[model samples]
Target: MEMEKEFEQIDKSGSWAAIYQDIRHEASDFPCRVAKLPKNKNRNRYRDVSPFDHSRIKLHQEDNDYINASLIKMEEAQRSYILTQGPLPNTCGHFWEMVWEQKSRGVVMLNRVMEKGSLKCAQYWPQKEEKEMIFEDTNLKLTLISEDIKSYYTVRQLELENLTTQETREILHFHYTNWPDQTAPESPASFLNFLFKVRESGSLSPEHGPVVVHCSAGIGRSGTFCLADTCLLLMDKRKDPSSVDIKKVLLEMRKFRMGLIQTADQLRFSYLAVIEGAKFIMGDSSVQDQWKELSHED
Candidate 1:
């Protein structure tokens, strides 16, 4: 019944806009004192997009523990996500350190290194030819083990090492190249396919640490991806997919971070992605083939 009501709202012309407006109206404006501190100011890529002090991730370093990242947990779905900004050139080392310290299995990057002549994220990973990158600030090294390129996404296997302890771990980088800057993907098909591919790796399971997800500011595209994934997971748990309140789920996540799902279009897209993804969770195995075909995944 609840799910049918959501569908009815979406089906009505111009209602999606109204729904997004309601969500915006209800978005909380919480304080992030540490993010505003002068010492931590330069750590943020976007001055306005600050992580909530309570939910922000703190690095293990004694001198400087700040990183523009937040830990978002969905208790019902048993999901934990670290949403962060695109790593800054100076902060790349800290990024890897967070990954290593958090024991994250995957990094879900939803933006490209460059978009329309602007740098959306730093080229933090080692290039193929270079094969390896060393982060002196964090005393860590990253080596490119292999790369798998798809039509709309790229999965790179990386080896991360701690220089101090000589410890090493494998990390998966899921880069979705199709999403445009500050907007949603063209369709949920490609995005859903990419999400499912990441899911197939079991990197997002509770057994592992939180998956690191980021876009330019770690809100718009990043929020959309996490919201859809979490909602679909909740749907699976409930058996009644329609009973999950997507809006409520998003609000819960926002408590852990700020200004998630930046635009109304992104919010709309999240709903669309969740609805489409629900089919796969509800025994529609054929939908996977349809998504692969629509997304042109190789």
Candidate 2:
């Protein structure tokens, strides 16, 4: 039986909530390193969000590197993603500093600056008509080169320059603006399409520094995106969709970034998205063969 097709024959008897709860309990045992750092915790955008100590990314020449972010590495897929929170007004400098220091090729933002009636994230990027936005505190400048807009997403090409070194680098900004709060995307196809769009940019390549991925709190949607991306890569690797375990994958990812797969729906949707994406490979032998080569070269 084809690996993806065999998934149709399985029973949906296991409770997603039960499995999610078990994993959350296990994650609690992982040390919360930032919680111990009073200064970093004070700098957190939200009082409830913090990174685990062992997996935290440290910065140089600063009191702390804690910006409510975690470095998630999937060696099998050859991906390194930096999962982080939306920047706070005070931490904006630190956010840009981390991007400069990490040599990230792109920033994957899954949430808009605001949602509903509250401010979810700071106005971190440059606005339209603004030629260049400088981060005064960090001594960095962001120059807007061009932007392409779609119904649900937008892509921006920006130039980041260091004032001290007078050096510059071009970075891609892939933003999914319409993903609803606390819910799944309209369909798996659109979401997968967006994921592939980023992949095509070569920003997620292992050679580049970990791409920064963040939402409001950097857990729910951020986690889902990473989980789905990682699962799709794994599916391509084994050439057997069912060979990958979604729950185990999410649990392993949570080790690096705490509280991943926030809701049961997000967890369920991750599986659906992975299966839908796997079909593209299973349905076409040519694409699967090419994907194997791309994986190796990448």
Candidate 3:
């Protein structure tokens, strides 16, 4: 334990990027079955991205079971999540279909509609009250009942109606619009604030169905969110924040999805955020407020 603490203190003993890259490359290069499926191109939000079949979310219907989504099961935390790409214009219906079929209580989106002059994702939900969007292909109607916009995020209450069953369910939408691709948050403060806010809602709870989490390709920023949240939960359960190994937790998460924590900078940022969060859990009230001031300055 003494050696471990000494090892922990040495922040630059090794390259986090090298460790992450080695582990990622060591994983199997599984054959992608989605490429062979009919209309597979339509299902993929990004032309190059696809989910591994072993952990992919299999829809109930035989006709359209293919979706670029993966089930992330953290059995210990009683947290089950569906990590998926932002919905494509053509696959918006299928996206909603997956949510309805999986009985997800909410969605945590980590990207904006457009970024870097590119279409990151389509408008998959309703924006206005008078003209809500209806996905005919999947027989689903999404109505936005209300919205709460924040400095860096927006929260929406949506009513999802299944046309066939004539059943409706309430779903929460937590969308974070900042944090550019391949980059970390300006500070860990804002990131943790957003994460705990989602947790407070009880939407990402075991009592509800799996919460759907997505960014653009559903790997970089989305993976970061899952990693941080799951680790925090495990720490709370163990009552020893220092015992949590952020890298090990991230590796466990990658088992369910591919290319999580995409860059070296991202990996480093994860460590920083985990340490900062541990401080908050350790009872440092002053450190908690630094991020709010830091975020505002940026």
Candidate 4:
């Protein structure tokens, strides 16, 4: 227990659910309003770890089930995820700001951003044990948990504050070294709203619920958003995601990005951490919905 207290790591020595609860929300903290990272082509980490081509790949092996939906990119006066990058923070202007530097304009997220003076009421800063987490060459306080290799970061603040069983819910998120300009906090909010909405709408499936995120070296903002996406999926699937089966989601993420998600030594059972963190903050967590088994049973 003392070891865990000093280091930000998920308790691997526990039950499946216990492990999951330990890593729930680790990225919902944002300290600096924004971060300006340089994208060195040679240093870039994004590679073969491709996004799931839902069409070609089978989401599930139960039968012959696959995502056969056509991804139509319909441009509109107000472009959003449905159009360009799929639910980008800023729709019309500053759309390309993300490309300015390595990770300059766009927001970075994953776990708790353990700091006091942040932009919003409750900000999303990438959490770390060192309070000040250095990302993309910049350093900020972070409360990141580790074990194996997986890490969890959710959208709700306080979810990743690294706490034990309790009630209040906290969101895990990536901390942008610098907050977006005055013109567009709404962009990110809208994008996140869309993601949660999509999950709630039943259009997206929990089978591939974990959000695929990757940044410069592949361990800061990307890690944060990945956690947030998982939380959203859990909310969509079962009001209490901790009760649902999430190991599979991390497995798929690993297949897509090698050392990316909740793998052994890679951060197991992240949802559990979020639950525990929530318990610490609000004293009562929120469970939105649940998953109804599909008729795919043979």
Best by TM-score: 1
| Global fold similarity of model 2 (TM-score) | 0.89
* Local distance difference test values of all predictions, in order: 0.90, 0.79, 0.81, 0.28
Q: Give per-residue CA lDDT, model 1, range 1-298, as digits (tens).
A: 3664676668676676787778777877778998899998779999989998889999998889999999998888889999999999989999999999999999999999998899978999987837689999899999999999999999999999999999999999999998886688989999999999999998897888999999899998999999999999998998788689888998988888878888777887887888888889999999988999999866
Best by lDDT: 1
Regions of model 4 farther than 4 Å from truth: 1-106, 109-214, 219-221, 262-266, 269-271, 277-298
Q: What are the models' TM-scores?
A: 0.96, 0.89, 0.90, 0.30
Error of 2 at 72 (Å): 0.7
Query: Alpha-carbon error at 120 in model 1, in Å?
Result: 1.3
Q: Which residue pairs collide, candidate 2?
A: none
Model 1 superposed RMSD (Cα) = 1.4
The Cα error of candidate 2 at residue 58, in Å, is: 1.6
In candidate 3, what are the lDDT values of residues 173-203, reduced to their tens digit? 9998778989998778888877767887888
lDDT of 1: 0.90
State in Å the error of residue 193, model 4. 17
lDDT of 4: 0.28
Over 1-298, each residue of candidate 4 has an lDDT whose tens digit, in order, gives: 2222322443533454455344343212222111112321221123322223431122222332222111111121111111111111111112111211112112223222232343211222333544632222111223344311211223322222112222222223233332121111222333343234334433233232222222332332343335435544444344443443344444433332333343332343234333433332232323221111111111
* Candidate 2, RMSD to the unseen true structure: 5.0
Model 1, residue 53: distance off in Å is 0.4
